[PDB]
PDB file of C-alpha atoms and ligand atoms in Angstrom:
ATOM      1  CA  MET A   1       0.092  -0.372   0.142  1.00  0.00           C
ATOM      2  CA  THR A   2       0.919   3.932  -0.023  1.00  0.00           C
ATOM      3  CA  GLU A   3       1.807   6.241   2.717  1.00  0.00           C
ATOM      4  CA  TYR A   4       2.041   9.591   2.777  1.00  0.00           C
ATOM      5  CA  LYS A   5       4.049  11.519   4.999  1.00  0.00           C
ATOM      6  CA  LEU A   6       2.297  14.649   5.891  1.00  0.00           C
ATOM      7  CA  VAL A   7       3.899  17.575   8.116  1.00  0.00           C
ATOM      8  CA  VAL A   8       1.978  20.291   9.354  1.00  0.00           C
ATOM      9  CA  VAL A   9       3.986  23.453  10.053  1.00  0.00           C
ATOM     10  CA  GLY A  10       2.832  26.836  11.214  1.00  0.00           C
ATOM     11  CA  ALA A  11       2.972  29.428  14.116  1.00  0.00           C
ATOM     12  CA  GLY A  12       2.162  28.638  17.500  1.00  0.00           C
ATOM     13  CA  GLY A  13      -1.217  28.474  18.862  1.00  0.00           C
ATOM     14  CA  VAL A  14      -3.014  28.146  15.250  1.00  0.00           C
ATOM     15  CA  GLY A  15      -4.591  24.927  15.523  1.00  0.00           C
ATOM     16  CA  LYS A  16      -1.874  22.276  13.989  1.00  0.00           C
ATOM     17  CA  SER A  17      -2.453  19.755  16.902  1.00  0.00           C
ATOM     18  CA  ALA A  18      -6.102  20.358  16.780  1.00  0.00           C
ATOM     19  CA  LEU A  19      -6.639  19.938  13.078  1.00  0.00           C
ATOM     20  CA  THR A  20      -4.452  16.634  13.313  1.00  0.00           C
ATOM     21  CA  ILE A  21      -6.346  15.097  16.246  1.00  0.00           C
ATOM     22  CA  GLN A  22      -9.469  16.293  14.702  1.00  0.00           C
ATOM     23  CA  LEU A  23      -8.683  14.213  11.492  1.00  0.00           C
ATOM     24  CA  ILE A  24      -7.278  11.154  13.555  1.00  0.00           C
ATOM     25  CA  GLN A  25      -9.183  10.997  16.479  1.00  0.00           C
ATOM     26  CA  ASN A  26     -12.432  12.776  15.309  1.00  0.00           C
ATOM     27  CA  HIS A  27     -12.096  15.133  18.669  1.00  0.00           C
ATOM     28  CA  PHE A  28     -11.741  18.643  19.028  1.00  0.00           C
ATOM     29  CA  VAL A  29      -9.176  19.274  21.740  1.00  0.00           C
ATOM     30  CA  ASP A  30      -9.960  22.023  23.534  1.00  0.00           C
ATOM     31  CA  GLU A  31      -7.033  22.922  25.833  1.00  0.00           C
ATOM     32  CA  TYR A  32      -3.758  24.660  24.438  1.00  0.00           C
ATOM     33  CA  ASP A  33      -0.847  21.834  25.037  1.00  0.00           C
ATOM     34  CA  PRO A  34       2.028  23.200  23.187  1.00  0.00           C
ATOM     35  CA  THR A  35       3.889  20.665  20.971  1.00  0.00           C
ATOM     36  CA  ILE A  36       7.360  20.251  21.175  1.00  0.00           C
ATOM     37  CA  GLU A  37       7.193  17.233  18.411  1.00  0.00           C
ATOM     38  CA  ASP A  38       4.679  14.293  17.724  1.00  0.00           C
ATOM     39  CA  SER A  39       3.703  11.938  14.989  1.00  0.00           C
ATOM     40  CA  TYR A  40       0.338  10.283  14.351  1.00  0.00           C
ATOM     41  CA  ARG A  41      -0.610   7.223  11.905  1.00  0.00           C
ATOM     42  CA  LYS A  42      -3.918   5.965  10.730  1.00  0.00           C
ATOM     43  CA  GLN A  43      -5.317   4.223   7.768  1.00  0.00           C
ATOM     44  CA  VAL A  44      -7.764   5.942   6.062  1.00  0.00           C
ATOM     45  CA  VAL A  45      -9.637   5.624   2.635  1.00  0.00           C
ATOM     46  CA  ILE A  46      -9.167   8.465  -0.233  1.00  0.00           C
ATOM     47  CA  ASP A  47     -10.268   7.991  -3.304  1.00  0.00           C
ATOM     48  CA  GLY A  48     -10.807   4.382  -3.130  1.00  0.00           C
ATOM     49  CA  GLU A  49      -7.663   3.860  -2.458  1.00  0.00           C
ATOM     50  CA  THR A  50      -6.497   2.535   1.060  1.00  0.00           C
ATOM     51  CA  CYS A  51      -3.572   4.542   2.138  1.00  0.00           C
ATOM     52  CA  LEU A  52      -1.618   4.888   5.246  1.00  0.00           C
ATOM     53  CA  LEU A  53      -1.386   8.430   6.911  1.00  0.00           C
ATOM     54  CA  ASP A  54       1.736   9.443   8.818  1.00  0.00           C
ATOM     55  CA  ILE A  55       1.385  13.194   9.959  1.00  0.00           C
ATOM     56  CA  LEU A  56       4.303  14.659  11.792  1.00  0.00           C
ATOM     57  CA  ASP A  57       2.860  17.285  13.970  1.00  0.00           C
ATOM     58  CA  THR A  58       5.711  20.099  14.324  1.00  0.00           C
ATOM     59  CA  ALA A  59       5.962  22.666  17.271  1.00  0.00           C
ATOM     60  CA  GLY A  60       5.341  26.359  16.247  1.00  0.00           C
ATOM     61  CA  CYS A  61      12.628  17.230   8.512  1.00  0.00           C
ATOM     62  CA  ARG A  62      13.842  15.985   4.387  1.00  0.00           C
ATOM     63  CA  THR A  63      11.393  12.908   4.924  1.00  0.00           C
ATOM     64  CA  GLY A  64       8.069  15.485   3.906  1.00  0.00           C
ATOM     65  CA  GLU A  65       6.508  14.244   1.423  1.00  0.00           C
ATOM     66  CA  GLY A  66       3.573  16.945   1.796  1.00  0.00           C
ATOM     67  CA  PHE A  67       3.342  20.043   4.079  1.00  0.00           C
ATOM     68  CA  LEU A  68       0.409  21.507   5.447  1.00  0.00           C
ATOM     69  CA  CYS A  69       1.089  25.619   5.854  1.00  0.00           C
ATOM     70  CA  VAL A  70      -1.350  26.586   8.654  1.00  0.00           C
ATOM     71  CA  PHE A  71      -2.300  29.885  10.021  1.00  0.00           C
ATOM     72  CA  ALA A  72      -5.595  31.167  11.794  1.00  0.00           C
ATOM     73  CA  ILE A  73      -7.969  33.682  10.120  1.00  0.00           C
ATOM     74  CA  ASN A  74      -7.612  35.684  13.773  1.00  0.00           C
ATOM     75  CA  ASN A  75      -4.465  35.567  14.029  1.00  0.00           C
ATOM     76  CA  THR A  76      -2.975  38.238  11.523  1.00  0.00           C
ATOM     77  CA  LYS A  77       0.651  37.718  12.546  1.00  0.00           C
ATOM     78  CA  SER A  78       0.482  33.764  12.212  1.00  0.00           C
ATOM     79  CA  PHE A  79      -0.707  34.596   8.418  1.00  0.00           C
ATOM     80  CA  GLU A  80       2.681  37.425   7.848  1.00  0.00           C
ATOM     81  CA  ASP A  81       4.929  34.919   9.107  1.00  0.00           C
ATOM     82  CA  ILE A  82       3.455  31.879   7.023  1.00  0.00           C
ATOM     83  CA  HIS A  83       6.315  32.749   4.154  1.00  0.00           C
ATOM     84  CA  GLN A  84       9.087  31.898   6.814  1.00  0.00           C
ATOM     85  CA  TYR A  85       7.779  28.396   6.521  1.00  0.00           C
ATOM     86  CA  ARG A  86       7.278  28.064   3.181  1.00  0.00           C
ATOM     87  CA  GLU A  87      10.461  29.472   2.285  1.00  0.00           C
ATOM     88  CA  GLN A  88      11.810  26.931   5.082  1.00  0.00           C
ATOM     89  CA  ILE A  89      10.456  23.836   3.575  1.00  0.00           C
ATOM     90  CA  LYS A  90      11.977  25.314  -0.239  1.00  0.00           C
ATOM     91  CA  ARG A  91      15.075  25.121   0.995  1.00  0.00           C
ATOM     92  CA  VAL A  92      15.275  22.124   2.754  1.00  0.00           C
ATOM     93  CA  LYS A  93      13.515  20.266   0.151  1.00  0.00           C
ATOM     94  CA  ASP A  94      15.600  22.119  -2.727  1.00  0.00           C
ATOM     95  CA  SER A  95      12.340  22.439  -5.057  1.00  0.00           C
ATOM     96  CA  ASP A  96      10.185  24.538  -6.105  1.00  0.00           C
ATOM     97  CA  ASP A  97       7.521  22.137  -6.559  1.00  0.00           C
ATOM     98  CA  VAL A  98       6.839  20.758  -3.025  1.00  0.00           C
ATOM     99  CA  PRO A  99       3.517  19.215  -2.595  1.00  0.00           C
ATOM    100  CA  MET A 100       1.673  22.141  -0.307  1.00  0.00           C
ATOM    101  CA  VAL A 101      -1.581  23.245   1.121  1.00  0.00           C
ATOM    102  CA  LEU A 102      -2.148  26.864   2.738  1.00  0.00           C
ATOM    103  CA  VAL A 103      -4.771  26.529   5.265  1.00  0.00           C
ATOM    104  CA  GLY A 104      -6.785  28.805   7.202  1.00  0.00           C
ATOM    105  CA  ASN A 105      -7.722  27.410  10.432  1.00  0.00           C
ATOM    106  CA  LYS A 106     -10.465  28.623  13.238  1.00  0.00           C
ATOM    107  CA  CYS A 107     -13.176  29.653  10.566  1.00  0.00           C
ATOM    108  CA  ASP A 108     -15.569  28.846  13.104  1.00  0.00           C
ATOM    109  CA  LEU A 109     -14.589  32.479  14.594  1.00  0.00           C
ATOM    110  CA  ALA A 110     -16.058  35.347  14.032  1.00  0.00           C
ATOM    111  CA  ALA A 111     -12.909  37.574  14.688  1.00  0.00           C
ATOM    112  CA  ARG A 112     -11.556  37.611  11.587  1.00  0.00           C
ATOM    113  CA  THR A 113      -8.844  39.516  10.897  1.00  0.00           C
ATOM    114  CA  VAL A 114      -7.342  37.775   7.689  1.00  0.00           C
ATOM    115  CA  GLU A 115      -9.297  38.367   4.760  1.00  0.00           C
ATOM    116  CA  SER A 116     -10.192  35.299   2.329  1.00  0.00           C
ATOM    117  CA  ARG A 117      -9.173  36.887  -0.818  1.00  0.00           C
ATOM    118  CA  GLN A 118      -5.702  38.001   0.927  1.00  0.00           C
ATOM    119  CA  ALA A 119      -4.635  34.679   1.665  1.00  0.00           C
ATOM    120  CA  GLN A 120      -6.058  33.364  -1.842  1.00  0.00           C
ATOM    121  CA  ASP A 121      -3.884  35.744  -3.383  1.00  0.00           C
ATOM    122  CA  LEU A 122      -0.965  34.596  -1.396  1.00  0.00           C
ATOM    123  CA  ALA A 123      -1.726  30.682  -2.409  1.00  0.00           C
ATOM    124  CA  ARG A 124      -2.124  31.625  -5.817  1.00  0.00           C
ATOM    125  CA  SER A 125       1.572  33.264  -6.123  1.00  0.00           C
ATOM    126  CA  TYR A 126       2.768  29.570  -4.162  1.00  0.00           C
ATOM    127  CA  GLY A 127       0.442  28.032  -6.691  1.00  0.00           C
ATOM    128  CA  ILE A 128      -1.011  25.926  -4.128  1.00  0.00           C
ATOM    129  CA  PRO A 129      -4.458  25.541  -2.547  1.00  0.00           C
ATOM    130  CA  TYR A 130      -6.376  27.211   0.116  1.00  0.00           C
ATOM    131  CA  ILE A 131      -8.478  25.534   2.002  1.00  0.00           C
ATOM    132  CA  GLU A 132     -10.353  27.474   5.144  1.00  0.00           C
ATOM    133  CA  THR A 133     -10.923  24.852   8.094  1.00  0.00           C
ATOM    134  CA  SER A 134     -12.163  24.397  11.781  1.00  0.00           C
ATOM    135  CA  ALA A 135     -10.780  21.921  13.688  1.00  0.00           C
ATOM    136  CA  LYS A 136     -13.523  22.202  16.635  1.00  0.00           C
ATOM    137  CA  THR A 137     -16.555  22.128  13.757  1.00  0.00           C
ATOM    138  CA  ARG A 138     -14.552  19.941  11.494  1.00  0.00           C
ATOM    139  CA  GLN A 139     -15.118  21.465   8.450  1.00  0.00           C
ATOM    140  CA  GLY A 140     -12.756  21.495   5.891  1.00  0.00           C
ATOM    141  CA  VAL A 141     -10.527  19.179   7.444  1.00  0.00           C
ATOM    142  CA  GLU A 142     -10.706  16.246   5.801  1.00  0.00           C
ATOM    143  CA  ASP A 143     -10.775  18.821   2.466  1.00  0.00           C
ATOM    144  CA  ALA A 144      -7.124  19.956   3.731  1.00  0.00           C
ATOM    145  CA  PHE A 145      -5.474  16.805   4.513  1.00  0.00           C
ATOM    146  CA  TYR A 146      -6.824  14.840   1.140  1.00  0.00           C
ATOM    147  CA  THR A 147      -6.579  17.596  -0.812  1.00  0.00           C
ATOM    148  CA  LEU A 148      -2.700  17.743   0.050  1.00  0.00           C
ATOM    149  CA  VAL A 149      -2.782  13.838  -0.356  1.00  0.00           C
ATOM    150  CA  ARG A 150      -3.928  14.776  -4.128  1.00  0.00           C
ATOM    151  CA  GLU A 151      -1.387  17.095  -4.427  1.00  0.00           C
ATOM    152  CA  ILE A 152       1.472  14.429  -3.727  1.00  0.00           C
ATOM    153  CA  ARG A 153      -0.267  12.358  -6.329  1.00  0.00           C
ATOM    154  CA  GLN A 154      -0.034  15.069  -9.022  1.00  0.00           C
ATOM    155  CA  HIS A 155       3.485  14.950  -8.038  1.00  0.00           C
TER     156      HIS A 155
HETATM  157  N1  GNP B 201     -12.227  27.382  17.860  1.00  0.00           N
HETATM  158  C1  GNP B 201     -11.595  27.104  17.489  1.00  0.00           C
HETATM  159  N2  GNP B 201     -10.296  26.866  18.048  1.00  0.00           N
HETATM  160  C2  GNP B 201      -9.401  26.024  17.627  1.00  0.00           C
HETATM  161  C3  GNP B 201      -9.065  26.109  16.510  1.00  0.00           C
HETATM  162  N3  GNP B 201      -8.208  24.985  16.421  1.00  0.00           N
HETATM  163  C4  GNP B 201      -7.437  25.097  17.725  1.00  0.00           C
HETATM  164  N4  GNP B 201      -7.928  26.062  18.591  1.00  0.00           N
HETATM  165  C5  GNP B 201      -7.831  26.248  19.639  1.00  0.00           C
HETATM  166  O1  GNP B 201      -6.555  27.108  19.448  1.00  0.00           O
HETATM  167  C6  GNP B 201      -5.609  26.362  20.815  1.00  0.00           C
HETATM  168  C7  GNP B 201      -4.615  26.414  20.039  1.00  0.00           C
HETATM  169  O2  GNP B 201      -4.577  24.915  19.595  1.00  0.00           O
HETATM  170  P1  GNP B 201      -3.330  23.882  19.247  1.00  0.00           P
HETATM  171  O3  GNP B 201      -3.924  23.358  18.199  1.00  0.00           O
HETATM  172  O4  GNP B 201      -2.610  23.446  19.989  1.00  0.00           O
HETATM  173  O5  GNP B 201      -2.598  24.986  18.394  1.00  0.00           O
HETATM  174  P2  GNP B 201      -1.121  24.420  17.816  1.00  0.00           P
HETATM  175  O6  GNP B 201      -0.732  24.721  16.622  1.00  0.00           O
HETATM  176  O7  GNP B 201      -0.703  22.991  17.767  1.00  0.00           O
HETATM  177  N5  GNP B 201       0.455  24.779  18.529  1.00  0.00           N
HETATM  178  P3  GNP B 201       1.988  24.646  18.705  1.00  0.00           P
HETATM  179  O8  GNP B 201       2.603  25.097  18.172  1.00  0.00           O
HETATM  180  O9  GNP B 201       1.989  25.014  20.124  1.00  0.00           O
HETATM  181  O10 GNP B 201       1.876  23.389  19.235  1.00  0.00           O
HETATM  182  C8  GNP B 201      -6.705  25.339  21.565  1.00  0.00           C
HETATM  183  O11 GNP B 201      -6.924  25.746  22.487  1.00  0.00           O
HETATM  184  C9  GNP B 201      -7.582  25.184  20.742  1.00  0.00           C
HETATM  185  O12 GNP B 201      -8.656  24.542  21.043  1.00  0.00           O
HETATM  186  C10 GNP B 201     -10.331  25.778  15.703  1.00  0.00           C
HETATM  187  O13 GNP B 201     -10.572  25.438  14.487  1.00  0.00           O
HETATM  188  N6  GNP B 201     -11.217  26.582  16.211  1.00  0.00           N
HETATM  189 MG1   MG B 202       0.241  21.675  18.680  1.00  0.00          MG
END
């Protein structure tokens, strides 16, 4: 079977761990336990293909096959600093064509300081898809992770 190595990156507190745990455990973590380094695995079916998701949850290397670049829509600075994570990845992989998805998390909150059109423009300049998610309501979570898997497939 095929295994997909996915790496979730982004600033602190944007919800990387809540996202990974919502996908894997179908459970929203209310608390904020800072991550130093964590790894999760789960067999899922994607487009009729049984595959193993291996997800590295990082704190706010070269083995990552795809990357979720996460900011929070109510955290302007986390969006302003996403370019640092993209460029870090681009450095390590030594490729301008790295499977990647731009994720705007916490889309259930009404305190939105990052406009969707702004994130769409950024994603477009990166040549990657933009997906808004909520680890709480599960909106867009499957969309984000599975879209990243499909981006790995096209590569
Ligand atoms: N309402 C809402 N709250 C969220 C969402 N995602 C995360 N949170 C909340 O925001 C906080 C941050 O969660 P967390 O996932 O740990 O962030 P993180 O990016 O992994 N932090 P670190 O880099 O420190 O490991 C938590 O209290 C969590 O409950 C979301 O989609 N909606
Ligand atoms: Mg975390």
